Amino acid sequence: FFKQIRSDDNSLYSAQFDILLGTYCNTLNFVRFLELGLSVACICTKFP
Amino acid sequence: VAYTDRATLNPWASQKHSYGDRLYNGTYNLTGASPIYSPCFKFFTPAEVNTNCNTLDRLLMEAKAVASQSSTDTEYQFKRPPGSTEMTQDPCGLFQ
Amino acid sequence: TTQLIQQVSLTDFFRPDIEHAGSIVLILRHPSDMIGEANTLTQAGRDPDVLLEGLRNLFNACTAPWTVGEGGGLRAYVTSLSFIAACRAEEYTDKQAADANRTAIVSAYGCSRMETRLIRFSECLRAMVQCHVFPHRFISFFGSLLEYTIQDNLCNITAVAKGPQEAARTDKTSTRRVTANIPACVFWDVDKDLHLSADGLKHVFLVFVYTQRRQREGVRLHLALSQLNEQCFGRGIGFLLGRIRAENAAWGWTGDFRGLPTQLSCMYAAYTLIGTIPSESVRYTRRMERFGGYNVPTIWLEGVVWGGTNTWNECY
Amino acid sequence: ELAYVRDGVIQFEVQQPMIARDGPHPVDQPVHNYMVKRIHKRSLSAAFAIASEALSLLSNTYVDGTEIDSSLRIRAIQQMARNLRTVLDSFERGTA
Amino acid sequence: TGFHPGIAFTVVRQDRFATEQLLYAERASESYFVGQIQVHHHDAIGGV
Amino acid sequence: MPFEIEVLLPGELSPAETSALQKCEGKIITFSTLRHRASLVDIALSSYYINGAPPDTLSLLEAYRMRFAAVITRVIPGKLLAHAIGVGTPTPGLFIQNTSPVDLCNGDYICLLPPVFGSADSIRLDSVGLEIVFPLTIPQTLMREIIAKVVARAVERTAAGADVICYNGRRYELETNLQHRDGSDAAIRTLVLNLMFSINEGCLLLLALIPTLLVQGAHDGYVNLLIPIYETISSWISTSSRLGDTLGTRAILRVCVFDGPSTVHPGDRTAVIQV
Amino acid sequence: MLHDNVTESLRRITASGGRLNPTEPLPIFGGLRPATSAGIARGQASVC
């Protein structure tokens, strides 16, 4: 690309960008079963 | 699909290239240069938006702020002028 | 400094989202005047109802057909020069660039029924030059496109009507200024034809060309750029268009002044002065450029000071 | 610097939960989403005029040996002030 | 003349009513960027 | 910077007259010479008086090319200010109150034409004994047509022993009702005469030079030729040229509205720039 | 139709059963606007 320019030509002062105005990520809530109400109806037992 | 036991209540308007289809569907432009508004337009003419292969329910995206359809200040119901911007709500235009 | 102008029009014949700034925009008169004008100006033995059909069948399939009559407060006012060029791309000598222009503008606009609108406009122009109602009398130079705002089927243009080109500050992408540019198919310069090829001041003309032979009408326009003044420019073009003038003047006691060559039968071209280039020598670049998805060649002028006094100089 | 922007963009990414089940059901894996939006550009407008014979006074023409024109100049200043104050409030209204 | 030519019609007409909507909006449902005021002057009828 | 003209309205003005002069905001007047102090007896109709009686249409078309026009800006109960158009770059909003039968679109070039229609511009200042006629501000496109039609009507009228003009989707009829068409026929006769004499002198001079113009075929020879008599040719040009330059009437103004109304019905005011 | 005096008779007839119809002489080119009235009583007339 070759481009000759006379004394102080226009189109040297070209300025225009794009912008990333942000990033929004979410996070989950961890369900603790024994902290529910439903666990009243069971006696959980660990048995390897 | 409505009354499955029949095919169509009125054969003189429903089928393609019929009388009613010819007179009211806008793809044929017969009632094109007429300034008078035509309610049957939205019923006869098959709608088309390019979101056919792209939506489950664009119902919400196509039932929000449809622009007005008729004039607003004329003694009669003239077709909406091109320099107008009044928006309204068309419930029945969605469910046909 | 300069001078701006504003106009709200429909976007049927022009879309500023597709024209780049610096393109010339043209203004139209009301089509209703053509009716009476052809009613009193048509030649004897010829029926102007063919003009009526042309106009009526044109405006039947362009936009909302209603409102185009007398009660029109909003209308199809402005058209792009590239538009009027590409609807007659079958008469410009540099075929390939004009053909690229045509296919690009057929694909860049609405996509639907423009092939229709194009031949409608071509047929309309053919009919008018056939009924001796010339297009140069109805199409004028508006300005060079500067900035716009669009809506659903309606636009708002602001263009430069007077003064230097690059003294107009606009809120564009790249740079606050902009330069004029024309499609490369209409760019015809009178100077190198006549071979004077001298630096210095050059005018810019807007010239039409008429070829009225029975059932074989022809209308095309260029944007001339010459050293000549407005006086002898008519002589210059009349000179290198000898064949058209001949075939137009030849096939266009009781006195019996019947069947003689009249002024409208012998007319072939009409032109106007619209600007000037008061530089040291004019430089222009033909670079291929993109209209959205297609590539078409254009002429990039520099330092054009738009002029005025829109008076048409005829050549018969 | 908004007038310098060609186009802006904001990015989302949400991850949805899942539920362990038993056969017969396809074993489930999480899902992840990646959405991207853009901004639309708009503007506002407001006008107000200063007539001739008001510009002729607000311009610092020579100090005249009367006090009629000075009173007229005060009148013009106050008129312009009121118009400009209203114009500036117009933007606070147009925001909402 | 008051004769029934063995064919009936279905009348379709549309009206237009004036209502009052009831809009509701969630907080922070809109990112809104404000540029800077710019001014322009251009002649008019008897006034700048 | 802009050129300024003062017109000192005298006393003894009936307030029923000044009430109408207050309507003269944007009408065009002409002076024979450009000064800053102008007397009311200079723009009055009694100033033209080219040959005794009030001027003709040819006389007025010849005046409008030699005088310097100036648009009447604001008028106050004391005096009348006016800005000269043509030179000076008037910075204020130089508006024009169109006085024409036909509309004015946005972006036309406006010229002048004497009142060759149902003249009603006259404001009759009787208390001072003088009256002022304004010109018609027509677009440059209807300039070649109005003259032609109004002269053809009279040249057919003297040939005793729907003529409408259209613009911007409006039609204004030229056939005035009364068939007692005196007055205006009289203020136009030296035009139809001076024009008719020129054309006949051209025809009967063309056919008096080449003996193979129509006698070798009006279609075969006339077109193939296309591809003290010597003090008459002079007499033809020396008059046909002065008539042509009289009916030129280069534009002076241009209606450029900027965020207003896009059409000017007769009687409205709009912004205008000079050329 | 084939004869014009029939297309004209139909229009003249139907111009008597209502108040929405073109003016008597046809416009050569336009939109065939109805002749505006002078009174507006209840509201915009909904065309059936």
Helix (H, G, I), strand (E, B) or coil at D69: helix
Q: Locate all alpha helices (DSSP H) within chain F, ordered by sequence.
A: 15-21, 57-63, 143-157, 189-206, 222-226, 233-246
Three-state secondary structure of chain C? CCEEEEEEECCCCCCCCCCCCCCEEEEECCCHHHHHHHHHHCCCCCCCHHHHHHHHHHHCCCCCCCCCCCCCCCCCCEEEHHHHHHCCCCCCCCHHHHHHHHHHHHHHCCCCCHHHHHHHHHHHHHHHHHCCCCHHHCEEEEEEEEEEEEECCEEEEEEEEEEECCCCCCCCCCCCCCCCEEECCCECCCCCCCCCCCCCCEEEEEEEEECCCCCCCCEEEEEEEECCCCCCHHHHHHHCCHHHHHHHHHCCCCCCCCCCCCCCCCCCEEEEEEEEECCCCCCCEEEEEEECCEEEEEEECCCCEECCCCCCEEEC
- F in contact with A (at least 3 C-beta pairs within 8 A): no
- Sequence-distant (≥ 6) Cβ neighbours of residue C7 within 8 angstroms: C27, C77, C78, C142, C156, C157, F106, F107, F262
Side chain identity at residue A15, one-letter code: A
Token pair 């899942």: residue: D18
Q: Would you call F107 and C69 a contact, using CB atoms and an 8 Å cutoff?
A: no
Token pair 């113009």: residue: F213
Side chain identity at residue G23, one-letter code: T
- The C-alpha atoms of residue B68 and residue E26 are separated, in whole angstroms, by 27
Q: Torsion over CA of B16, B17, B22 and B26, rounded to 10 degrees?
A: 60
- Tell me if the bond preceding B82 is cis, omega within 30° of 0: no
As a whole number of Å, the end-to-end CA separation of chain B is 13
Residue C218, CA distances (Å) to B42, C126, C210, F269 in order: 43, 6, 6, 42
**Closest listed residue to residue C18, CA positions, set C121, C139, C104:** C104
Residue C11, CA distances (Å) to C75, C76, C221 in order: 10, 7, 22
Three-state secondary structure of C152-214? CCEEEEEEEEEEECCCCCCCCCCCCCCCCEEECCCECCCCCCCCCCCCCCEEEEEEEEECCCC
- Sequence-distant (≥ 6) Cβ neighbours of residue A33 within 8 angstroms: A39
Under 8 Å between Cβ of B80 and C67: no
Helix (H, G, I), strand (E, B) or coil at A28: coil
- Sequence-distant (≥ 6) Cβ neighbours of residue F101 within 8 angstroms: F117, F172, F266
Helix (H, G, I), strand (E, B) or coil at D87: helix
Q: Give B46→chain E minimum CA distance, Å.
A: 18
How crowded is residue C224: how many other Cβ atoms within 10 Å of its Cβ? 26
Structure-block tokens of residue E32: 């809104």
- The C-alpha atoms of residue C80 and residue C141 are separated, in whole angstroms, by 10
How crowded is residue C180: how many other Cβ atoms within 10 Å of its Cβ? 22
Asked if C293 is an interface residue toward chain G (Cβ–Cβ < 8 A), one would say: no
Q: Answer positive or negative: Cα dihedral of F226, F228, F233, F239.
A: negative
Size of interface A-C (CB pairs under 8 A): 10
Asked if F160 is an interface residue toward chain C (Cβ–Cβ < 8 A), one would say: no
Nearest-by-CA chain D residue for A29: D17
User: C293: phi > 0 → left, psi -120 to 50 → alpha, else beta; which?
Assistant: alpha
Q: Answer positive or negative: Cα dihedral of B23, B25, B28, B34.
A: positive
Under 8 Å between Cβ of C227 and C201: yes
DSSP-assigned beta bridge partners for residue F130 = F125
Q: List CB contacts (< 8 A) between B39 and chain G.
A: 47
Token pair 């600007």: residue: C275
Model resolution, angstroms = 5.3
Under 8 Å between Cβ of C67 and C59: no
Asked if F269 is an interface residue toward chain D (Cβ–Cβ < 8 A), one would say: no
The CB-based long-range contact list for F257-260 (8 Å cut-off, 24+ gap) reads F257/C6, F257/F106, F258/C4, F258/C5, F258/C6, F258/E42, F258/E43, F258/E44, F259/C6, F259/D47, F259/E44, F260/E44, F260/E45
Q: Would you call E14 and B70 a contact, using CB atoms and an 8 Å cutoff?
A: yes
Three-state secondary structure of D19-62? CCCCCCCCCCCCEECCEEEECCCCCCCCCCCCECCCHHHHCCCC
Method: cryo-EM
Q: List CB contacts (< 8 A) between C8 and chain B.
A: 83
- G in contact with A (at least 3 C-beta pairs within 8 A): no
Q: Answer positive or negative: Cα dihedral of F136, F137, F143, F149.
A: negative
- The C-alpha atoms of residue C185 and residue C104 are separated, in whole angstroms, by 13
Under 8 Å between Cβ of C186 and C81: yes
Structure-block tokens of residue D79: 């008129």
Under 8 Å between Cβ of C28 and C139: yes
Q: Would you call F107 and C161 a contact, using CB atoms and an 8 Å cutoff?
A: yes
Q: Give G46→chain E minimum CA distance, Å.
A: 6
Nearest-by-CA chain E residue for F270: E45
- Strands F37-38 vs F5-7: parallel, antiparallel or unpaired: parallel
Nearest-by-CA chain G residue for C70: G30
User: What is the phi/psi pair of residue F180, to 5°?
Assistant: -95, 70
Nearest-by-CA chain F residue for C141: F107
Question: How would DSSP label each residue in F44-108?
Answer: SGGGT-TBSBSP-HHHHHHHTTTSEEEE---B-SS-EEEEESSSS---S--EEE--SSS-B-TT-
**Closest listed residue to residue C109, CA positions, set C88, C90, C91, C86:** C86
What is the widest separation between alpha-carbon atoms in chain D?
104
Chains that touch C (3 or more CB pairs under 8 A): A, B, F, G
Under 8 Å between Cβ of C163 and C305: yes
Q: Would you call A10 and C173 a contact, using CB atoms and an 8 Å cutoff?
A: no
Structure-block tokens of residue F77: 């109960």
Strand order in the sheet with F68-71: F28-31, F68-71, F80-84, F5-7, F37-38
Asked if B65 is an interface residue toward chain C (Cβ–Cβ < 8 A), one would say: no
Residue C117, CA distances (Å) to C50, C56, C121, C152, F126 in order: 18, 12, 6, 19, 61
**Closest listed residue to residue F104, CA positions, set F251, F256, F252, F274:** F256
Strand order in the sheet with A17-25: A17-25, D5-13, D35-38
Size of interface A-D (CB pairs under 8 A): 41
Give, as one character, the DSSP assignment of residue F176: -
**C residues 68..97 contacting B (CB < 8 A):** 73-74
Q: List CB contacts (< 8 A) between B32 and chain C.
A: 60, 65
Under 8 Å between Cβ of C85 and C73: no
Q: Give E14→chain B minimum CA distance, Å.
A: 6
**Closest listed residue to residue C232, CA positions, set C134, C313, C135:** C313
**CA angle (C225 as vertex; C307, C246 as ends), nearest 5:** 115
- The C-alpha atoms of residue C4 and residue C158 are separated, in whole angstroms, by 7
Chains that touch G (3 or more CB pairs under 8 A): B, C, E
Q: List CB contacts (< 8 A) between B34 and chain G.
A: 32
**CA angle (C177 as vertex; C173, C180 as ends), nearest 5:** 105
DSSP-assigned beta bridge partners for residue C25 = C80, C143
Q: List CB contacts (< 8 A) between D55 and chain E.
A: 48
Side-chain half-sphere exposure of E16, counting CA atoms within 13 A? 18
Which residues on chain E place their C-beta less than 8 Å from a C-beta of chain D?
A: 31, 33-38, 44, 46-48
Q: List CB contacts (< 8 A) between F273 and chain C.
A: 3, 162
Q: Would you call A17 and D11 a contact, using CB atoms and an 8 Å cutoff?
A: no
**D residues 23..62 contacting E (CB < 8 A):** 39, 49-52, 55
Side chain identity at residue F131, one-letter code: E
Structure-block tokens of residue F24: 């003269």
Token pair 């330069």: residue: C179
**Which of C8, C70, C259 has the CB atom closest to F219's CB atom?**
C259
Q: List CB contacts (< 8 A) between C261 and chain F.
A: 222-223, 226
Structure-block tokens of residue C50: 């063919």
Q: Torsion over CA of D79, D81, D83 and D85, rounded to 10 degrees?
A: -150
**CA angle (F23 as vertex; F20, F27 as ends), nearest 5:** 120
Q: List CB contacts (< 8 A) between F171 and chain C.
A: 36
Asked if B73 is an interface residue toward chain C (Cβ–Cβ < 8 A), one would say: no
**CA angle (C302 as vertex; C300, C304 as ends), nearest 5:** 115
- The C-alpha atoms of residue C286 and residue C283 are separated, in whole angstroms, by 10
- The C-alpha atoms of residue B70 and residue E8 are separated, in whole angstroms, by 27
**Closest listed residue to residue C236, CA positions, set C315, C140, C311:** C315
Residue F130, CA distances (Å) to F6, F42, F47, F55, F124 in order: 18, 10, 10, 15, 7
Q: Would you call F107 and C8 a contact, using CB atoms and an 8 Å cutoff?
A: no
Asked if B76 is an interface residue toward chain C (Cβ–Cβ < 8 A), one would say: no
Structure-block tokens of residue F257: 């509205």
Q: Answer positive or negative: Cα dihedral of C258, C262, C264, C266.
A: positive
**Closest listed residue to residue C40, CA positions, set F174, F177, F112:** F174
Question: How would DSSP label each residue in E10-44?
Answer: -----------------TT----------------
- The C-alpha atoms of residue F25 and residue F95 are separated, in whole angstroms, by 9
Asked if F225 is an interface residue toward chain C (Cβ–Cβ < 8 A), one would say: no
How crowded is residue B21: how many other Cβ atoms within 10 Å of its Cβ? 17
Q: List CB contacts (< 8 A) between A16 and chain D.
A: 4-6
**G residues 15..44 contacting C (CB < 8 A):** 27-31, 33
Burial of D14 (0-12, 13-18, 19+ CB in 10 A): middle
- Sequence-distant (≥ 6) Cβ neighbours of residue F120 within 8 angstroms: none
- The C-alpha atoms of residue A38 and residue D90 are separated, in whole angstroms, by 58
Q: Would you call A14 and C177 a contact, using CB atoms and an 8 Å cutoff?
A: no
Asked if B33 is an interface residue toward chain C (Cβ–Cβ < 8 A), one would say: yes
**What number of H helices and E strands is found in chain F?**
6, 14
Q: Give F102→chain E minimum CA distance, Å.
A: 21
- The C-alpha atoms of residue G24 and residue F70 are separated, in whole angstroms, by 48
User: What is the phi/psi pair of residue C80, to 5°?
Assistant: -75, 150
Q: List CB contacts (< 8 A) between G46 and chain B.
A: 77
Chains that touch E (3 or more CB pairs under 8 A): B, D, F, G
Q: Would you call G30 and C32 a contact, using CB atoms and an 8 Å cutoff?
A: yes
Q: List CB contacts (< 8 A) between G37 and chain B.
A: 75
Burial of C38 (0-12, 13-18, 19+ CB in 10 A): buried
Q: List CB contacts (< 8 A) between A17 and chain D.
A: 4-6
Q: Give D96→chain E minimum CA distance, Å.
A: 12
- Sequence-distant (≥ 6) Cβ neighbours of residue C104 within 8 angstroms: C291, C294, C295, C296
User: What is the phi/psi pair of residue C312, to 5°?
Assistant: -90, 130
Asked if E16 is an interface residue toward chain G (Cβ–Cβ < 8 A), one would say: yes
Structure-block tokens of residue A21: 């105005």
Q: Give E46→chain B minimum CA distance, Å.
A: 28
User: F217: phi > 0 → left, psi -120 to 50 → alpha, else beta; which?
Assistant: left
Three-state secondary structure of chain B? CCCCCCCCCCCCCCCCCCHHHHHHCHHHCCCCCCCECCCCHHHHCCCCCCCHHHCCCCCHHHCCCCECCECCCCCCCEECCCCCCCECCCCHHHHC
User: What is the phi/psi pair of residue B71, to 5°?
Assistant: -65, 170
